[PDB]
Design a protein around this nucleic acid. Sequence first.
RNA 1: AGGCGUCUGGGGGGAACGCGGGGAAGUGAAACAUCUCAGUACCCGUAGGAAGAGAAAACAAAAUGUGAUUCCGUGAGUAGUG
RNA 2: AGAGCCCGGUACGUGAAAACCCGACGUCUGUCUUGAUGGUGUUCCCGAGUAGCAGCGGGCCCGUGGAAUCUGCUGUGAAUCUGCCGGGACCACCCGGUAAGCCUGAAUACUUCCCAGUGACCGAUAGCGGAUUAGUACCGUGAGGGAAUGGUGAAAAGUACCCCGGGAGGGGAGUGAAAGAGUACCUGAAACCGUGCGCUUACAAUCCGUCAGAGCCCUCGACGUGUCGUGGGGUGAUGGCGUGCCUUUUGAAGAAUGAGCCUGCGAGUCAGGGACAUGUCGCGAGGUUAACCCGGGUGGGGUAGCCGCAGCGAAAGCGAGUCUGAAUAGGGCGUAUCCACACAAGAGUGUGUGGUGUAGUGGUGUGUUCUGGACCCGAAGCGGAGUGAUCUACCCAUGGCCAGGGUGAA
RNA 3: AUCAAACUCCGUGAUAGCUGGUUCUCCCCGAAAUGCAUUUAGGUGCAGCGUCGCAUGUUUCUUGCCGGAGGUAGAGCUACUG
RNA 4: CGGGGGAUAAGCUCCGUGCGUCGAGAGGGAAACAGCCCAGAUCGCCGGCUAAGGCCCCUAAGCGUGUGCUAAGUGGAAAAGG
RNA 5: CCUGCAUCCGGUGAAGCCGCCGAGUGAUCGAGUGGUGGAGGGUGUGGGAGUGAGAAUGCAGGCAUGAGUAGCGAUUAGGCAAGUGAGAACCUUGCCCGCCGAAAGACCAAGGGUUCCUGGGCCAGGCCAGUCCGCCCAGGGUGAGUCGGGACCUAAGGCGAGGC
RNA 6: AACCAUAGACUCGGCGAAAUUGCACUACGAGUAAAGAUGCUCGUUACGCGCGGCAGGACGAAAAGACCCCGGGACCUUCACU
RNA 7: UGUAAGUGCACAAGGGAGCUUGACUGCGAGACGGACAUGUCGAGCAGGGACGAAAGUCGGGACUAGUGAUCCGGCACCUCUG
Lengths: 124, 156, 96, 63
Amino acid sequence: ARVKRALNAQKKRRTVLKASKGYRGQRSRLYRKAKEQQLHSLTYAYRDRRARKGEFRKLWISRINAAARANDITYNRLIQGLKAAGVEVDRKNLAELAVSDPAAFTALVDVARAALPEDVNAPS
Amino acid sequence: RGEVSGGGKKPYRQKGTGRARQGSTRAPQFTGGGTVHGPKPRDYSQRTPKKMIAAALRGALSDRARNDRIHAVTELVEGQTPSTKSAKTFLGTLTENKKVLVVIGRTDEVGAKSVRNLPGVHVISPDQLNTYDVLNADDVVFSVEALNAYISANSK
Amino acid sequence: GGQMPIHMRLPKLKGFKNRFRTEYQVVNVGDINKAFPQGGTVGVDELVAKGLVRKNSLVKVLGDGKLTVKVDVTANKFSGSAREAITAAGGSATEL
Amino acid sequence: PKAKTHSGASKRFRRTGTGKIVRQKANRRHLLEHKPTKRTRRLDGRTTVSAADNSRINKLLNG
RNA sequence: AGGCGUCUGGGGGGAACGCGGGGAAGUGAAACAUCUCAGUACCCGUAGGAAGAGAAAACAAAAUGUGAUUCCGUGAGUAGUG
RNA sequence: AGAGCCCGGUACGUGAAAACCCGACGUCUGUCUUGAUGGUGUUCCCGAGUAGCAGCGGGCCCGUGGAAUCUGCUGUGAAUCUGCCGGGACCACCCGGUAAGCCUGAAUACUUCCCAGUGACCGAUAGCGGAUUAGUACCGUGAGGGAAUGGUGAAAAGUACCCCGGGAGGGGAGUGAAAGAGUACCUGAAACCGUGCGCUUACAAUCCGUCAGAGCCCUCGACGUGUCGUGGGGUGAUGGCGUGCCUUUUGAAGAAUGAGCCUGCGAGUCAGGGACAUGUCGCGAGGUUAACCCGGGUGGGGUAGCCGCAGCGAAAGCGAGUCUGAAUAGGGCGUAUCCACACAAGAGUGUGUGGUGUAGUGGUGUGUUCUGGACCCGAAGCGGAGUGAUCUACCCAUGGCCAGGGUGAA
RNA sequence: AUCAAACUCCGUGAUAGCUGGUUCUCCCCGAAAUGCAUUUAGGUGCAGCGUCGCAUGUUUCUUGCCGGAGGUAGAGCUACUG
RNA sequence: CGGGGGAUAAGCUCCGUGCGUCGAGAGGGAAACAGCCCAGAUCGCCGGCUAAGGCCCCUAAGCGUGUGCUAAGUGGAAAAGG
RNA sequence: CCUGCAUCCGGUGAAGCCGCCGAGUGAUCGAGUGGUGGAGGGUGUGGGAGUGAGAAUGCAGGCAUGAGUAGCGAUUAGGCAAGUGAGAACCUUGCCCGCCGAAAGACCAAGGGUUCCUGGGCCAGGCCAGUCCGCCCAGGGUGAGUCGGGACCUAAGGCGAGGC
RNA sequence: AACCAUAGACUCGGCGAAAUUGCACUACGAGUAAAGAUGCUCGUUACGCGCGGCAGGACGAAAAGACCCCGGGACCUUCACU
RNA sequence: UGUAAGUGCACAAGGGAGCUUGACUGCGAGACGGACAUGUCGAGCAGGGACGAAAGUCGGGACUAGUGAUCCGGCACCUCUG
Ligand SMILES: [Mg+2]
Ligand SMILES: [Mg+2]
Ligand SMILES: [Mg+2]
Ligand SMILES: [Mg+2]
Ligand SMILES: [Mg+2]
Ligand SMILES: [Mg+2]
Ligand SMILES: [Mg+2]
Ligand SMILES: [Mg+2]
Ligand SMILES: [Mg+2]
Ligand SMILES: [Mg+2]
Ligand SMILES: [Mg+2]
Ligand SMILES: [Mg+2]
Ligand SMILES: [Mg+2]
Ligand SMILES: [Mg+2]
Ligand SMILES: [Mg+2]
Ligand SMILES: [Mg+2]
Ligand SMILES: [Mg+2]
Ligand SMILES: [Mg+2]
Ligand SMILES: [Mg+2]
Ligand SMILES: [Mg+2]
Ligand SMILES: [Mg+2]
Ligand SMILES: [Mg+2]
Ligand SMILES: [Mg+2]
Ligand SMILES: [Mg+2]
Ligand SMILES: [Mg+2]
Ligand SMILES: [Mg+2]
Ligand SMILES: [Mg+2]
Ligand SMILES: [Mg+2]
Ligand SMILES: [Mg+2]
Ligand SMILES: [Mg+2]
Ligand SMILES: [Mg+2]
Ligand SMILES: [Mg+2]
Ligand SMILES: [Mg+2]
Ligand SMILES: [Mg+2]
Ligand SMILES: [Mg+2]
Ligand SMILES: [Mg+2]
Ligand SMILES: [Mg+2]
Ligand SMILES: [Mg+2]
Ligand SMILES: [Mg+2]
Ligand SMILES: [Mg+2]
Ligand SMILES: [Mg+2]
Ligand SMILES: [Mg+2]
Ligand SMILES: [Mg+2]
Ligand SMILES: [Mg+2]
Ligand SMILES: [Mg+2]
Ligand SMILES: [Mg+2]
Ligand SMILES: [Mg+2]
Ligand SMILES: [Mg+2]
Ligand SMILES: [Mg+2]
Ligand SMILES: [Mg+2]
Ligand SMILES: [Mg+2]
Ligand SMILES: [Mg+2]
Ligand SMILES: [Mg+2]
Ligand SMILES: [Mg+2]
Ligand SMILES: [Mg+2]
Ligand SMILES: [Mg+2]
Ligand SMILES: [Mg+2]
Ligand SMILES: [Mg+2]
Ligand SMILES: [Mg+2]
Ligand SMILES: [Mg+2]
Ligand SMILES: [Mg+2]
Ligand SMILES: [Mg+2]
Ligand SMILES: [Mg+2]
Ligand SMILES: [Mg+2]
Ligand SMILES: [Mg+2]
Ligand SMILES: [Mg+2]
Ligand SMILES: [Mg+2]
Ligand SMILES: [Mg+2]
Ligand SMILES: [Mg+2]
Ligand SMILES: [Mg+2]
Ligand SMILES: [Mg+2]
Ligand SMILES: [Mg+2]
Ligand SMILES: [Mg+2]
Ligand SMILES: [Mg+2]
Ligand SMILES: [Mg+2]
Ligand SMILES: [Mg+2]
Ligand SMILES: [Mg+2]
Ligand SMILES: [Mg+2]
Ligand SMILES: [Mg+2]
Ligand SMILES: [Mg+2]
Ligand SMILES: [Mg+2]
Ligand SMILES: [Mg+2]
Ligand SMILES: [Mg+2]
Ligand SMILES: [Mg+2]
Ligand SMILES: [Mg+2]
Ligand SMILES: [Mg+2]
Ligand SMILES: [Mg+2]
Ligand SMILES: [Mg+2]
Ligand SMILES: [Mg+2]
Ligand SMILES: [Mg+2]
Ligand SMILES: [Mg+2]
Ligand SMILES: [Mg+2]
Ligand SMILES: [Mg+2]
Ligand SMILES: [Mg+2]
Ligand SMILES: [Mg+2]
Ligand SMILES: [Mg+2]
Ligand SMILES: [Mg+2]
Ligand SMILES: [Mg+2]
Ligand SMILES: [Mg+2]
Ligand SMILES: [Mg+2]
Ligand SMILES: [Mg+2]
Ligand SMILES: [Mg+2]
Ligand SMILES: [Mg+2]
Ligand SMILES: [Mg+2]
Ligand SMILES: [Mg+2]
Ligand SMILES: [Mg+2]
Ligand SMILES: [Mg+2]
Ligand SMILES: [Mg+2]
Ligand SMILES: [Mg+2]
Ligand SMILES: [Mg+2]
Ligand SMILES: [Mg+2]
Ligand SMILES: [Mg+2]
Ligand SMILES: [Mg+2]
Ligand SMILES: [Mg+2]
Ligand SMILES: [Mg+2]
Ligand SMILES: [Mg+2]
Ligand SMILES: [Mg+2]
Ligand SMILES: [Mg+2]
Ligand SMILES: [Mg+2]
Ligand SMILES: [Mg+2]
Ligand SMILES: [Mg+2]
Ligand SMILES: [Mg+2]
Ligand SMILES: [Mg+2]
Ligand SMILES: [Mg+2]
Ligand SMILES: [Mg+2]
Ligand SMILES: [Mg+2]
Ligand SMILES: [Mg+2]
Ligand SMILES: [Mg+2]
Ligand SMILES: [Mg+2]
Ligand SMILES: [Mg+2]
Ligand SMILES: [Mg+2]
Ligand SMILES: [Mg+2]
Ligand SMILES: [Mg+2]
Ligand SMILES: [Mg+2]
Ligand SMILES: [Mg+2]
Ligand SMILES: [Mg+2]
Ligand SMILES: [Mg+2]
Ligand SMILES: [Mg+2]
Ligand SMILES: [Mg+2]
Ligand SMILES: [Mg+2]
Ligand SMILES: [Mg+2]
């Protein structure tokens, strides 16, 4: 029989435009050009979803380093002391505690300093 | 494309025109032209072994007998006087299902001529029994002579 | 690829056809023995009825198998082994 | 339209009982002076075609 | 020969179907002269509702066989030919 | 607004002035009965530039090859029953027939027209080019080419009347179910152009997005003036990241090409008992029907045909063997495959006995392939048949045209 | 309005070893630019390289040890030719 | 990597290598840079441990520790020779 | 999408379209809900597809920028008073000025067919507005014994009874 | 070289045009690559929107390059073939 | 050491001498490398020979180049056909 491509294409095109709503220029009015930037947007979202881990870790490390330097001890030595004491709390916890509880941060720093070895330059 | 009218010339020059470079006025790409692969006249006749068809018919009738859907009538209604009301009453008394098949010998006409009008009834001569017809109806009513002729012919 | 291929650069078969051929149809004495337990007289008509050879074709019997039942044989040609087997089986065979 | 069988192939090949394909060897028709005796003797007779080209030949003979 | 008088017939048209002639080039052979395309397109002279053909100077091969012509299915893509 | 019982009609019955054609029943036409039946020996007949022969060409599978038969042309040119021609040159013996004159219905091929019917065929860019002014308008002096244009509603009841206005056009009031039905009239999408509302931007180097992300605004709950919540939405100041799509390319975001946008139209199908391969169903040492008959019907008959049943050998042939060959002497092909039992070397395997015993063939799904143009579309050029010397070239018959002023041969 | 062979209908969907285009989804596996040949080099046949199935299935590969023949790197010249 | 053609020239060409990669491969590293170094993407997580390279700020981490050299922005362009 | 079979929905609103709210690992789905509409649709299991677009300097129809930019088709050039009417530099009357005048004038044949006159209006056209028109509407209009042709005669040429 | 007039070019009124067009809030110095970057790295400059002018660049627009080669046509010449 | 090079030959494959045509017929267990067909060697059997008393060797030339498919046709012979 004779069949007319009426609904099949229009369904996909309606959904494409509905998802694409909110862009700039022709990209939000012309279907043909739209889906290209749809693919680009999805790819960028996929990439930055993974990059988020590194970005948040970067922010947390920066904040912890600032807090430690303010409290008069280096970040590397602080982490070494934490490792020696065997406390497994995470960088996010240290950052949140530092922004919230300076007294607790100072107590932890003192614990780490006490747990530090005698000489960091020893060949051991 | 080769059978529609017109389109015998190259519409214009080849190089220098600058528009789409084309060859014929009724090409499939133009509107109103022919179709690439259009349906063509053909025949759907199919070969089927006689043994296959006979086995199918025998199985159908065997199942109908197993489920007890066969009845035998000496004659439909008093002859020489067609009357649909009597036939309808008799069929209703016999069975109440929507659809039923009635087979009557060729040399008799009154029964068929009286039972033709019922919506759920189909008439068929005993010599043309077929699997589709038996399956379509729920029950089959056999005339005595027709049944005897069929059994004799098939057993011979 | 332009190069003359195998079907182009090989010799032909060796001989001709001899359209005056006269083929027969083979019948096995072992098959006859297996099919005719009680024995007796055999012929083209009953052989065709049993469906051992084509009906219009010429008939010839071969004696590859072993025979142990008396039978009377009517055919068009015979082989030495079949003749000896039939004779030793206490039967007789004739040729048209 | 019934299939066409190539004339040459069916004229230059033969089928055995079980289905193998056979042919004859070439380089024999003429000019065999310098050829020693064992030459033609080995070069005589039939032979089964190599399995490498079997697929193509079978198609030709059947068509 | 030619010329007068009087009767009988014909000049064109029609979508397809037939009969007898004439009759092309693109293209395959990875080219191409032979071939094939094809006796196709087209043309010519022709009538009908159908036409043409038709009453063995026919096959086969030792069977005491068939018995005008026409049209289909097999006979086989085989016996051959290039 | 989906009707067996509202209307048109369907089942069934009837029914014609005139005419048509068919068939059957009636004067008339004509051969024969001046003639028919079975025998015999003798004298005459059975289709002329024909048959045959020689040369040059056609079409039969036969593409001049040994060339049978038929036939076109040119030369030569035969006989009448113990005559003549045919059985692929030809001879002999057999077998069939009687050309050189004419008619002959039935089995078959097709539809410009008319009557009656059908669609797992199309529904206005499809469908015949043509649902309307149709081979019209239009283009070309010619052959010729060749267009787009349906839907108001149940009826027009097509908006009286009043007002703004020249009208066009519009607002009230009425018609009607609707006037979001007002002859531009069903349902009304996208490119496109708007008015109103909310947010944001005038120190900024962006294949224009994403992940974070304050403020503002809208909203759903619980708690009160606004503050949280396993809450949603729009906006986004600001930070990180970030070299379009398809073709063809070893190699490209490219400055290698295609794309203005939008809605439609455009592409691996069909035919054949074809072939190979692969699943599926019956039958089983059988399977299997064409063409054709009888059935409004897909059903029932129809043994003419094709494949396995034994192979080897070019053959005369033979056969569980067979060809090569002087050779049981080795080899090539075959006896389904296997196990067991004996004999050999253990040159790898072969040679002899007994068993289970072999599976092919029709329909059909799917991949490929064969012949038809076979995924889609794309030129310079060839032949056949027709059309143009009103411009442009040349010639033919017949008219018209050249204002004024100098130079001075016989 | 076009002439190193005019224009229209047909043969005609003339034919291309050449340029271009071929659309809905997911699951598994996963290539080559090498050799031979070619009126052959931008074409194409076969081989190797992939996938599915069938049959025998470790026969594939790495390391240790053992039996094997080469004529390079090196080196040498009263050991041959320079 | 071992070679030929070349002026021991080319981002040149022609060979061999159970050789790597790209081609048919994202991430991180070297500013950008397919053929270099590490490393083989079933999907989600506001979790830990590391190779290559880095730790003055741009930009995450040491203006780290101990022993020596540099007067030239050598560091952050190259040879005969002085 | 069309179909065999068995079912259910529908003037108490069936088909598309535009939203909200949601849902599946995909091509997407909703017998969950809102506006428009008015006449046929869905599920289950079989059979057949002209069955799925972004690109071929593709084709039919509609619409974007350059753009309210260039031009408004010569070698003469208009001005004034009055009138008509809603509108006048482009229409009518009157008065000045300029141009042509071997033509920018008066006619024949060829060439077109109603462009000629009267009366009506100005949504189509005139490259702008138009009361005007070579716009259209309705009616009317073409008068030969002597003018040009035929009934008078012939050429270059065409047809061609017989015939070759 | 200077000056003067005519028709445009300029503002105002009316009608209203075409080629092209993947996208745009389209800088530059030095670099980086298919070896010549508005669209990539570092760095410098730069209020938003318009109008009249100049044309170096945007490999600007025009015709699937005529020059070269491959493949296929056409015409022409002859002691190339038929 | 016939005909270039290499591999070899001082035991001969260098040369000399006597006899003689195995430069046969019918066969071939198995291997060599090759995409295809072409190419190479071979132990051993039978007939009838050559050399040598015997054991024993001989299916051309110390080895590797001296060549060419298909189709069509000619010539001799044959226990094929007709
Ligand atoms: Mg935004
Ligand atoms: Mg990580
Ligand atoms: Mg264009
Ligand atoms: Mg088309
Ligand atoms: Mg059409
Ligand atoms: Mg059509
Ligand atoms: Mg049947
Ligand atoms: Mg043949
Ligand atoms: Mg020979
Ligand atoms: Mg010989
Ligand atoms: Mg031989
Ligand atoms: Mg292969
Ligand atoms: Mg006539
Ligand atoms: Mg060719
Ligand atoms: Mg050719
Ligand atoms: Mg022919
Ligand atoms: Mg007639
Ligand atoms: Mg006849
Ligand atoms: Mg005749
Ligand atoms: Mg036949
Ligand atoms: Mg209806
Ligand atoms: Mg009536
Ligand atoms: Mg011939
Ligand atoms: Mg001949
Ligand atoms: Mg004969
Ligand atoms: Mg006789
Ligand atoms: Mg006669
Ligand atoms: Mg007939
Ligand atoms: Mg429509
Ligand atoms: Mg015309
Ligand atoms: Mg109403
Ligand atoms: Mg409209
Ligand atoms: Mg509408
Ligand atoms: Mg700002
Ligand atoms: Mg920058
Ligand atoms: Mg970015
Ligand atoms: Mg960047
Ligand atoms: Mg491509
Ligand atoms: Mg590439
Ligand atoms: Mg590639
Ligand atoms: Mg690439
Ligand atoms: Mg660019
Ligand atoms: Mg490109
Ligand atoms: Mg380009
Ligand atoms: Mg290119
Ligand atoms: Mg387009
Ligand atoms: Mg355009
Ligand atoms: Mg096939
Ligand atoms: Mg199969
Ligand atoms: Mg089965
Ligand atoms: Mg055979
Ligand atoms: Mg043997
Ligand atoms: Mg032509
Ligand atoms: Mg003329
Ligand atoms: Mg004088
Ligand atoms: Mg010409
Ligand atoms: Mg013309
Ligand atoms: Mg043709
Ligand atoms: Mg045609
Ligand atoms: Mg064409
Ligand atoms: Mg082609
Ligand atoms: Mg291309
Ligand atoms: Mg893999
Ligand atoms: Mg090579
Ligand atoms: Mg193992
Ligand atoms: Mg050694
Ligand atoms: Mg050395
Ligand atoms: Mg020396
Ligand atoms: Mg190197
Ligand atoms: Mg080198
Ligand atoms: Mg190169
Ligand atoms: Mg290489
Ligand atoms: Mg890789
Ligand atoms: Mg990469
Ligand atoms: Mg990177
Ligand atoms: Mg992985
Ligand atoms: Mg660590
Ligand atoms: Mg490290
Ligand atoms: Mg830091
Ligand atoms: Mg330091
Ligand atoms: Mg130190
Ligand atoms: Mg430096
Ligand atoms: Mg130096
Ligand atoms: Mg020095
Ligand atoms: Mg439907
Ligand atoms: Mg209902
Ligand atoms: Mg309703
Ligand atoms: Mg409603
Ligand atoms: Mg409605
Ligand atoms: Mg179904
Ligand atoms: Mg289906
Ligand atoms: Mg099908
Ligand atoms: Mg289709
Ligand atoms: Mg589209
Ligand atoms: Mg267009
Ligand atoms: Mg524009
Ligand atoms: Mg302008
Ligand atoms: Mg202007
Ligand atoms: Mg003008
Ligand atoms: Mg005026
Ligand atoms: Mg003048
Ligand atoms: Mg004058
Ligand atoms: Mg003048
Ligand atoms: Mg005129
Ligand atoms: Mg006139
Ligand atoms: Mg007038
Ligand atoms: Mg008027
Ligand atoms: Mg007007
Ligand atoms: Mg107009
Ligand atoms: Mg008028
Ligand atoms: Mg008059
Ligand atoms: Mg004359
Ligand atoms: Mg005449
Ligand atoms: Mg100057
Ligand atoms: Mg002045
Ligand atoms: Mg002016
Ligand atoms: Mg100007
Ligand atoms: Mg100006
Ligand atoms: Mg304008
Ligand atoms: Mg373009
Ligand atoms: Mg450069
Ligand atoms: Mg540059
Ligand atoms: Mg350049
Ligand atoms: Mg750049
Ligand atoms: Mg630039
Ligand atoms: Mg950027
Ligand atoms: Mg940077
Ligand atoms: Mg500045
Ligand atoms: Mg330029
Ligand atoms: Mg350009
Ligand atoms: Mg060119
Ligand atoms: Mg050329
Ligand atoms: Mg020509
Ligand atoms: Mg010697
Ligand atoms: Mg010899
Ligand atoms: Mg062998
Ligand atoms: Mg001997
Ligand atoms: Mg030997
Ligand atoms: Mg020798
Ligand atoms: Mg010697
Ligand atoms: Mg040949």
